[PDB]
Ligand binder design. Sequence first.
Ligand SMILES: O=c1ccn([C@@H]2O[C@H](COP(=O)(O)OP(=O)(O)O)[C@@H](O)[C@H]2O)c(=O)[nH]1
Ligand SMILES: [Cl-]
Ligand SMILES: [Hg+2]
Ligand SMILES: [Hg+2]
Ligand SMILES: [Hg+2]
Ligand SMILES: [Hg+2]
Ligand SMILES: [Hg+2]
Ligand SMILES: [Mn+2]
Length: 263
Amino acid sequence: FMVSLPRMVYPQPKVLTPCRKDVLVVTPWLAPIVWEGTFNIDILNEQFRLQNTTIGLTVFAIKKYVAFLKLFLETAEKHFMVGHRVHYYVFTDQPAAVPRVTLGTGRQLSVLEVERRFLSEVDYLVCVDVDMEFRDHVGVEILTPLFGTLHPGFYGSSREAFTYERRPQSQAYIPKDEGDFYYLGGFFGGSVQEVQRLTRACHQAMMVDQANGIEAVWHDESHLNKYLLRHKPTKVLSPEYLWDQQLLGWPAVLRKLRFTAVP
Ligand SMILES: O=c1ccn([C@@H]2O[C@H](COP(=O)(O)OP(=O)(O)O)[C@@H](O)[C@H]2O)c(=O)[nH]1
Ligand SMILES: [Cl-]
Ligand SMILES: [Hg+2]
Ligand SMILES: [Hg+2]
Ligand SMILES: [Hg+2]
Ligand SMILES: [Hg+2]
Ligand SMILES: [Hg+2]
Ligand SMILES: [Mn+2]
């Protein structure tokens, strides 16, 4: 049951005025593609807060990657789901090496040394790489049953150029005439149920490949792409959500650089 929104004053949407004229804002299966200018964050914040939404953010920090945790967490505190309940899950082989980061109210962090837990603790799961930093708003506009993020190096490429696994012997195989987009393995998510279904599917597919003596060209990312090809995401995040300014600069098409690789 969703309670009614309160009175709100904002610009009236204009039916005869495109949101963006430079980019695709909706997929062929009617899933929005999230770009700056397509959403009113005040309306979305209201909708998700009225549901007391809790977002889980998972990251793996093994070996030398634990060094990226401080900046990652500090910047997440300034830009990730601010105003909403957030539960960070840091999977690491060095529990004592996790930095003591100060968190805002309603936000918590759990250190797990290296699934029903997620089902009872959070509503949505967001899975990202740790060698990154938030530089701008990353909020509830991304929440949906299942979402993928456009790889910054292939958003303008033809499917032929996508680095999908091209060997038929692999479970991640995708032929040259198939494919919608090339999604990043480093930023995906959705409801706990959908995220677990995806990881369960990929885990099994990778086991089959291993038994068959084959490893997908881009590992988990290759399997992720096969999954999202066969199970269309309900939202697709633009490259604003995972960019590399050092290698790609700052194109006009990107009004904001929200989550980026650390040099
Ligand atoms: O502890 C880790 C290890 C890896 N990664 C992410 O997973 C990617 C691929 O890891 P892999 O070990 O397969 O290759 P490598 O990290 O040596 O380039 C890394 O680049 C990161 O983006 C991470 O976030 N935490
Ligand atoms: Cl991840
Ligand atoms: Hg718009
Ligand atoms: Hg995850
Ligand atoms: Hg993860
Ligand atoms: Hg998969
Ligand atoms: Hg996957
Ligand atoms: Mn990375």
